[PDB]
Design a protein around this nucleic acid. Sequence first.
RNA 1: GAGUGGCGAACGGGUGAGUAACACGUGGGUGAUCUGCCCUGCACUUUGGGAUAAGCCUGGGAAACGUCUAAUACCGAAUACACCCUGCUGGUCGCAUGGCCUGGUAGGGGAAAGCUGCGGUGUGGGAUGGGCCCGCGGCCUAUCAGCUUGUUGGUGGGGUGAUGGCCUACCAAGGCGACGACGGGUAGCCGGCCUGAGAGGGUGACCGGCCACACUGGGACUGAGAUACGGCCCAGACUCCUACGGGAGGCAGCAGUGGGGAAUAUUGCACAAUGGGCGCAAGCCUGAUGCAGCGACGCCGC
Lengths: 138, 83, 94, 91
Amino acid sequence: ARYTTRKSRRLGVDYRQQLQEKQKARFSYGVMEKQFRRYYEEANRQPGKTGDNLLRILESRLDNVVYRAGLARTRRMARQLVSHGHFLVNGVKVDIPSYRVSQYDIIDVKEKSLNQRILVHQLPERAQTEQLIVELYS
Amino acid sequence: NIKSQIKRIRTNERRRLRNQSVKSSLRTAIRGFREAVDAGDKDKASELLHATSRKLDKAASKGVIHPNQAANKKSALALALNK
Amino acid sequence: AVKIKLTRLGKIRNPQYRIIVADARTRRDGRAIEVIGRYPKEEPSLIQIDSERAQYWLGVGAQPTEPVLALLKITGDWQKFKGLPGAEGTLKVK
Amino acid sequence: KGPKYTPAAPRGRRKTAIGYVVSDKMQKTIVVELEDRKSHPLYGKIIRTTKKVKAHDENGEAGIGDRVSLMETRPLSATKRWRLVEILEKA
RNA sequence: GAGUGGCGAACGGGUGAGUAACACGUGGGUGAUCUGCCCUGCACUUUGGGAUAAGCCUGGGAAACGUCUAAUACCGAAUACACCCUGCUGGUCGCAUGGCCUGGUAGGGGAAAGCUGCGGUGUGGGAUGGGCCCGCGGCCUAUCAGCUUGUUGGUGGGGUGAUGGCCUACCAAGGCGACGACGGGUAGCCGGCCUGAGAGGGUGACCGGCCACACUGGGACUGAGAUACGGCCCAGACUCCUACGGGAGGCAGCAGUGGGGAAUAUUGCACAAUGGGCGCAAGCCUGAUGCAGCGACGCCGC
Ligand SMILES: [Mg+2]
Ligand SMILES: [Mg+2]
Ligand SMILES: [Mg+2]
Ligand SMILES: [Mg+2]
Ligand SMILES: [Mg+2]
Ligand SMILES: [Mg+2]
Ligand SMILES: [Mg+2]
Ligand SMILES: [Mg+2]
Ligand SMILES: [Mg+2]
Ligand SMILES: [Mg+2]
C-alpha cells in the first residue's frame, strides 16, 4: 500500500490537534498507519526520550535518505527510484523503501540509471512535534 | 491383517506350547515336594529338593521363568526342608 | 541404545541442526540427554562441537548416526576416540 | 591383563518427623500427629495444619502423649510408611 | 517368488472419550527393584540325538483356510567356581529391617551356533530407558454427615522384576472425617498462551513433556519391554461378500467420502535432506519427515 496537495492543505504546513501532527508526519514520509504504529512501539522500548527516538527511526528510512540526499526531488519521486532498484547498499540491491540504514552504511547507485555517493556517519539526533504523538497513544 | 502378523501368530502357538510344558513340569515337581514334607518324610524330601532346585534353575536358563523367580522358589523349598 | 543425532530447528528451506545425544526411540525433535554441539547452508559449513563431551559419550558407547560420523571425522573427535593416526585440523570459517 | 572384577563405586537421606502420639492401639504401630505451618498464598495467615501418620513401633515402647522422632521407610503395610527412631519425653 | 528361522512389529503417528487419581506439576526415596540392542573388562564356544513346515497325493468350496527332507529352529548330557540356594562363622558401615568386603569357608546346581570378515552363551562394570512409594501444590458443591469388614494392623504361607491385604487362612478391633470423609457435577494435566502496572482472571490451539484410550466390554499369550491402532481369544452392537455350504472387516495413520455444523484443505510429489528398523555391506521399506497445492484464516513486506 502506497497512498498514491490537498491532504496537506487540511493540516496547513504544506484530540483535535493531536491527530493533525501525526497526519503530516505520516503523509510526509509516506508511511501506512500500521507501519507508523510499529515504529512508535519500537521507539518506547529504546532508552532516552521516547518521542525523540521516533523521529530518529523515521529519518533512518532508506527512501528518506534519498530525499535528504536530494538524488531525487520530492520524497514521492524517490519511491519510484528505490523500488525499481536503482540504488545499492553495501553491494546489494535494496528494492525496499522501509530499509532503515544504520551507521557505516554505503549507499551507491547502480550502473546506468541515467536521468555522488554520500555516507552515513551516525543516526542523526532530533536537532538534525514528538510530544503530541507520544501523548496521542497510550 | 495382511502383514507378517500371520507368521508371528504361528510362532505364538509354537512358543506357548514350549513354555506351558516347562511351567507345568515345575508345578508337579514343587507339588510332589510339599506332600513329602507334610508326611514327615525327611530322606525323601531332602532328595526332592535337589531334584526340584536343579529343574527350577534350568527353566531360568531357558529364558522362561526369569532367574529372580527361580531363586525365590529355591529359597522357599530349602527353608521348608530345614524344619 | 544412546545415539548422537541431528535435530532440525530451522525455518522452511533453511535448516539449522544441533548435535543432540538421545535414545534411538525418541522422536526427532524430542528430549535430549545432552546437547553437545551444532551444525549446512554456507559456503563453509558451520560446525561446532564440545571435544570433551564427545569423548565422554563415545567412550560410554553412544553410536553416531551416519551423517554425524562425517562431522566427527572432519573435526577429529572420532580420531581421538578411535586412536588412529589421521589426527585433527579442519573447518575454519573465514 | 584385566582384573576379572571391578568396583561398584552413596546413600541419600530419608526425611524425618517429630510429633505427639495418638491412639497407639494397633499391634506395634503408633499413629503420630505431625504439625505443619505454611503461610496461606493470598491472605498470609500462618495456618496450623495437622495430619495422622502411621509409624511402625516394634515391641510397643512409646505411649499416648509421647513426642516420638520418626523416619521414612518402604511400605511395611498400606498406609504405614514410617518407623520410630527415638523416644523423647513420656506420658 | 512363496516357506521355516532371526530381529523389528511396545518405537514413530493419531485423537481427548475416560480419570478430581501419585493421573499431572515440582521435590526427594529405591538397604524394595528390572533393562534387548549399544561398548569393554574376564572366561569359554565341549558332545550327541529326535522332529517339522516347504515339496507330493487326498477330501472341502463361489471365495479363503495322508506319506517325506534341512538350520544360528527345538532338545539328554558334560564343563563354569564368576553366578543362584541353604548351613556354620570373620570384620566393618548405620538410619531399623539390613547393607557391603566378588569376605572366608563345604554342601547342591546352573550355559552356547555356526558360514564367508560378522556372530554365539555366562558374569563384573558403565550408559540408557523404565517400574514402585511418599512431602507439598493445583476447580464447583453440605439443597451431600456419616463412611469402611480385606476394611486398619499382626503372624505364618502363596505371589511379583520388586516392597506391599497384592492375594489367602487364623487371632486382634481398629481405620478415615468439619483441616470437608463417603457422594453428585464438570475436567486430560503442564511448559506455556491471551490480558493486567501488579496481584489476579481466562484458556490448554500450533510447538515440547507426562497420562489415558484404539467399535463396546472382559482376558491372557509371545517377549528384554504390551492400553499389544494397521495382533490373538471370547462376548455384545453394527455393516459387507455369498453359487446360502461358508467367510471377512473397524481411518480417534495420511489423503478422501457422506453426514452434523456459522465454519476448516489435495483420493499431491519424493525418500535428495534429518530421525528410525533390518542387513557384513551394496541396499530395501518409512503418508514419520522434507516439500507442493488450496483458503486474506493470521502476522509482516512491496
Ligand atoms: Mg517367597
Ligand atoms: Mg468425582
Ligand atoms: Mg530379543
Ligand atoms: Mg471429558
Ligand atoms: Mg486493575
Ligand atoms: Mg476395546
Ligand atoms: Mg513372559
Ligand atoms: Mg487403523
Ligand atoms: Mg501391532
Ligand atoms: Mg483422515
